[PDB]
Amino acid sequence: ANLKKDYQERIVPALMKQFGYTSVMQVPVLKKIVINQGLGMATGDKKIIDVAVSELTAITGQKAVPTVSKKDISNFKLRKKMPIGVMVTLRREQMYEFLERLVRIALPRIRGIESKLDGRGNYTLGINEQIIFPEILGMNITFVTSAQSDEEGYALLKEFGLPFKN
RNA sequence: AGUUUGACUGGGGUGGUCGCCUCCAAAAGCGUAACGGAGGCUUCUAAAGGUACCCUCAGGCCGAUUGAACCGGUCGCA
Numbered sequence: 497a498n499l500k501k502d503y504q505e506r507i508v509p510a511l512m513k514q515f516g517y518t519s520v521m522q523v524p525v526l527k528k529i530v531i532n533q534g535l536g537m538a539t540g541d542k543k544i545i546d547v548a549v550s551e552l553t554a555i556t557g558q559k560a561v562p563t564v565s566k567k568d569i570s571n572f573k574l575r576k577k578m579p580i581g582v583m584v585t586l587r588r589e590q591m592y593e594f595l596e597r598l599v600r601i602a603l604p605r606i607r608g609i610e611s612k613l614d615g616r617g618n619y620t621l622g623i624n625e626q627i628i629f630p631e632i633l634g635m636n637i638t639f640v641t642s643a644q645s646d647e648e649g650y651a652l653l654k655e656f657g658l659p660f661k662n
Numbered sequence: 663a664g665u666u667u668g669a670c671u672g673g674g675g676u677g678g679u680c681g682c683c684u685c686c687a688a689a690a691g692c693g694u695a696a697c698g699g700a701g702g703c704u705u706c707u708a709a710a711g712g713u714a715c716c717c718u719c720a721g722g723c724c725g726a727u728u729g730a731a732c733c734g735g736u737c738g739c740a
C-alpha cells in the first residue's frame with residue numbers, strides 16, 4: 497500500500513486531466529505483474545528447479561509454481577513433461593508492495609531501461625541478474641495494464657517511477 | 663519294410679501368397695473380382711474404467727535475459 501495511495505489519491509487525478517476522459521474507468525490501471533524465468537538447463541540437471549522455487553519465493557513473498565513443457569523438441573532435449581520454468585503472478589496489494597521494492601532498490605542496484613511495448617500497452621522487462629533485488633539466471637517481468645495503446649500505457653508507467661529512458 | 667512329402671497360379675517350376683482390420687477399385691441403399699492400388703494386426707489401460715464438478719488446442723504475429731522451450735497480449739471451428 498505504498499504506491500496505492502500515490503496512484504488513487506494522486507496519480508489518477510492527473511491522467512483524466514490530460515487524456516480527457518469523460519469518466520474514471522477509461523484511465524489505464526496495471527492489473528498484475530507476472531514474473532517468469534526459463535530453466536532449459538534443467539532438462540539435464542533438474543536439481544536446480546527446486547532451488548529456483550526457493551529463490552523465486554523470497555523476492556515476491558508469495559509461493560511460485562513450476563511450469564511444465566509443452567513441445568517435443570530434441571534440440572533442447574525437450575519432451576512434453578519436463579519442468580523448465582517458474583512463474584509467480586502478483587496481484588492487488590501484493591504487486592503494489594513488490595513494485596516499491598523494485599523502483600527504489602532494484603534499478604538502483606543495476607550494473608536505465610528500454611522503451612518498447614508489445615503494442616497493446618504491456619511493458620515487459622528482462623533483467624539478466626537476479627541479485628538486483630534484496631532477498632537474493634534472470635527473470636522476466638510483465639506489467640499487464642488496462643490501457644489501450646502505448647500512449648496510455650506510458651503515462652501510467654512513468655507515473656509510478658519506472659526509470660525508462662529519454 | 664510301410665508310408666508321408668499342400669494349394670493358388672494368364673502352363674508348371676522359381677518367386678509371392680494363405681487368418682483378421684481400414685481405404686480405393688465399387689457404377690450417390692446393401693453387396694460385388696483380379697499374382698489390381700495403398701497401409702496395419704496376433705495388443706494395451708487398476709486407470710487410459712464409473713460418476714460429479716471444471717477447463718480448451720495447433721499455428722502465426724508483437725513484446726521480452728541465456729531463448730521452434732518460459733511468460734504477457736491477440737488472430738485463431740480446432
Ligand SMILES: [Mg+2]
Pocket residue numbers: none
Ligand atoms: Mg497300403
Ligand SMILES: [Mg+2]
Pocket residue numbers: none
Ligand atoms: Mg497346383
Ligand SMILES: [Mg+2]
Pocket residue numbers: none
Ligand atoms: Mg454402395
Ligand SMILES: [Mg+2]
Pocket residue numbers: 689
Ligand atoms: Mg449403385
